[PDB]
DNA sequence: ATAACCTAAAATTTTATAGCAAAATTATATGGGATT
DNA sequence: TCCCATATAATTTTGCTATAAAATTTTAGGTTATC
């Protein structure tokens, strides 16, 4: 625990109990401080210069702020567990990264209601992307993270009710494969109604489907969405499947859609979306599965006194 | 700092630039700490089970379960700073309150539509308290706190456009009086419209002003609602007449008005109207002048997977 | 002749917060004054 | 008894920022299917 990495690999330790892309995100920290000169640094005389310096050589090296603000993070609870040992006395990574560095991040815009169309317009049609045409229609229509899109089964259908039960992921990671995720609580657990639109996708998904390949993971088979292959899709699967869809729609048409148009991108569109309906936010809250309301508040529109003018009329 | 009271002591020096109202609510806690044991204990032979035994004598005391929270929040922070400098290692304030004692908290019900309607009528018809009719109109209609409305004046209302600019509060205490309280940055300043009945009211409340003595303060002066002796009213002013008329009131009809039909109720009916008649909560959040939107937000119910469903439903 | 899929690897984004008191509002004891 | 004002006391309302996990997306290198 005297030098940076040997904090920070003693706090992997007392704090183990994570999943599998935690240990990939604390490794690839861990190959950053050890090319780093902080890492071996002895944490009784990493100064608060020290820490801000790094941060600059960071975002040198290429790092998004992001990623260099969360590396911080972890960075500052290593050297908190060190300051409750008594190891050093004061933090030197409790500054704000914003005095240091400028947050250059591109900020994420949904899809607009005229680009929504257009672009399922463009997927039905085209002889190659049509297959998935329905999980997009699905996406769109109920704000469900790509993950959850492919961990669902026959299973978790209620056509009776047309309801969609989600409460597990389908993820997938170099040497271990597949494996199912499910929450701790029942609060990670929620329903989605399906419209008109999300059922037929569904039904169409259904009576579609062929070639799967024996495929029982924790209990789980009969996936809906699958690969050439006959094994369920995965998170980077439609992500590569949306790289080359987007730059096929923009060489087709004149305007082309944002560079951030990711299946991510469909749940934010869906929030916005309904949000701008003047969507209830704690009902919006349930649907999306976010564990505080303020994190659903952020995709409604900031307000001003116009706004609140012709509101506060609407409702007199 | 060694004894608890010389280390609450020391923390009230510490952070000086306090309002007066704070510092009424320090000397509060520490005329506690000198009429309790825990007082004069010293810093390092107070353990957890002190500080059990401690909220167990303010709760036989009868303070409220806020009020012990609150003061113990205080104690938490004085032992935080006590750890970062004097020989401190455990804080034994780390601790929920509800663990020790329960919450006898009285939900604030609102009032209903029929009750303000019959509320508002006998205020008109009794000859006591009819010149207070206006003032309540506003509180309704505007969602006010107490004290921003007895900081209104002239200038603070724009009759071309019916825009109320809360910029500023007037408070009095005893011993320094009258002072204007004002935000540090502009967004504590907000500016609410006026319908209707609060138009009219504001015309009310200037055409039928007299007696007013002279009063200038930080250059505001021409305040709107005063009291029989000539100089503004106060929250104590106005907290002290709801009482008297909420016990007026309940003596003539059967449906008695919940216990705490004060001020702050009629802020509380405005806030809770709104947000039931599904209101922008960030539209709302402006209108109240909140710092943080998680307040908003509590006054919308909690939703279910039935109500989710429903909205989903609406905007399909 | 070019994408189109697949995967290990690397990068980035999404997700997630009470409470380490201030500072307001309200109730009460007290007394002089106006009403029933 | 009720109103009013006020010092005192009690109670309620209010305010700021993440002491990283765990996802999703991109990319380099390669093979395979369709324009």
Redesign the pocket.
């Known amino acids: 625990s005297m030098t940076v990495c040997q904090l920070y690999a003693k706090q992997i330790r007392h ?1 183990g109990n ?2 599998h ?2 240990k ?3 490794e ?1 920290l861990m190959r950053i401080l050890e090319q780093d000169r902080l890492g071996s640094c002895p944490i009784d005389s990493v100064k608060l210069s020290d820490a801000k310096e790094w941060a600059l050589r960071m975002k040198e090296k ?6 260099i ?2 590396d911080k ?2 960075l ?2 290593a050297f ?1 567990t060190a300051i409750q040992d008594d190891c050093i006395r004061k ?1 030197p990574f ?1 500054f ?1 990264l914003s005095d240091v560095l400028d947050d250059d ?2 900020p ?1 815009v949904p899809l607009t209601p005229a680009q929504e169309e257009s672009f399922l317009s463009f997927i039905q049609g085209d ?2 992307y049509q297959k998935h045409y329905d999980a997009i229609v699905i996406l769109l229509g109920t704000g469900l ?4 899109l492919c961990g669902l089964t026959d299973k978790d259908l209620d056509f009776e009710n047309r309801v969609i039960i989600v409460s597990h ?1 389908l ?1 997938r990671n ?1 040497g271990v494969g597949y494996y199912i ?1 499910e929450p701790k609580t029942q609060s990670g657990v929620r329903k989605i109604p399906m419209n008109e639109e999300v059922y037929q996708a569904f039904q169409r998904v259904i009576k579609n489907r062929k070639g799967a390949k024996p495929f029982i993971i924790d209990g789980y088979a009969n996936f809906l969405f699958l ?3 006959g094994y369920p899709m995965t ?10 869809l987007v730059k ?1 729609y923009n060489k087709s048409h004149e305007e082309a859609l944002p560079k ?1 148009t ?4 469909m ?2 569109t869906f929030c916005t979306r309904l949000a701008n309906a003047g969507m209830n936010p704690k009902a919006l809250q349930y649907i999306m599965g ?3 309301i ?2 659903t508040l952020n995709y409604y529109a900031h307000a001003t006194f116009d706004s609140a003018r012709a509101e506060m009329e609407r409702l007199a």
């Open positions: 704090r994570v999943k892309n935690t990939l995100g604390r690839r290429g790092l998004s702020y992001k990623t603000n969360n993070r972890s500052k609870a908190y933090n409790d704000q991040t591109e994420k002889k190659v993270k790509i993950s959850e992921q993820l170099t995720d690969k050439q292959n998170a980077v699967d439609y992500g590569g499947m949306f790289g080359r096929k951030t990711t299946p991510h991108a749940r934010h976010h564990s505080n303020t994190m």
